[PDB]
Each structure stands twice: as structure tokens, then as C-alpha cells.
Design a protein around this ligand. Sequence first.
Ligand SMILES: NC(=O)[C@H]1CCCN(C(=O)Cc2cccc3ncsc23)C1
Ligand SMILES: [Zn+2]
Length: 139
Amino acid sequence: SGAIYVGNYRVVNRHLATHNDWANLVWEDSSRDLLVSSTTAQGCDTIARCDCQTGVYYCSSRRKHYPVSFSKPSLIFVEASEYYPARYQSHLMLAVGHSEPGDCGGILRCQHGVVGIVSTGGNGLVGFADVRDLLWLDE
Ligand SMILES: NC(=O)[C@H]1CCCN(C(=O)Cc2cccc3ncsc23)C1
Ligand SMILES: [Zn+2]
């Protein structure tokens, strides 16, 4: 679990969104596994606006932060689950590292701010849904 709170927005994994998230929906994209809902309180998370390929992510399954090199956001095949059929997930970035299903929502950050959230994993690789292109999250 985990979310990004920026201004009057809450960013979560679309497959983990609540009834409250859907009742206050702003935007969702199943191809990216993202959902953004409105909030009443302000959020102060800084979103990174960069092309960094190194950062640190939180891994709840180890209660630890790990440093990683990660690929540029791209279309990557993701196997079926109780949430989605087999498909290509866009805006996805991979890194060599540990993750487990309950690790989704863990934040990836560089020196500039929040880069994305854990969304996929398996085979010693962790996938992060990028959020750096969502310029509207600030304005
Ligand atoms: N975005 C999706 O389509 C995901 C929906 C939930 C299931 N997905 C996984 O990758 C499961 C998983 C297994 C093993 C490590 C792992 N680490 C994070 S999730 C994860 C795919
Ligand atoms: Zn950066």
C-alpha cells in the first residue's frame, strides 16, 4: 500500500483504489495502473520534473529504503492477475531489486522529488509507474 499526496490530489495504484477514490475520481488509466482522486486537505509532496535514472525506493516487505538504477518509462508486458488481463503497461520503469505484491504504493524518489510508485515485480525486478509527465498535478 501507499499513495502520493500533492496539493488537492491523491495518487494511488489503480488496482488498489478504494470506493472513496472512485467517488472522488479526477483521472484513471488502466494501461498505467494509476488513479488520481481529490482530497480536502493539502498535500506537500514535491513531484520531480527530470530525466533521472537513479533514485531510492521504499520496500515495506523489508522495512527498508534501497538505492536503484532504473530504465526510462516504456511499454512493458505484464502477466494476468485478479486485477488485469495479460497486457502492455505504459509509462513503466524497471530496476534490479526486491519487491512483493504488498509493496505496491511504495514511493521512488530522486534528488528532485517523487518519481513514481511500485506497481509490478517478479524475477528480482521491480517496476515503477512514472508520474513525472503528469504536469497538471502541480497546477
Ligand atoms: N500493475 C500490475 O498489473 C500489477 C497488479 C498486481 C499484480 N502484479 C504484480 O506484479 C504482482 C507482484 C508479484 C511479485 C512482486 C511484486 N512487486 C510488486 S507487484 C508484484 C501486476
Ligand atoms: Zn530527478
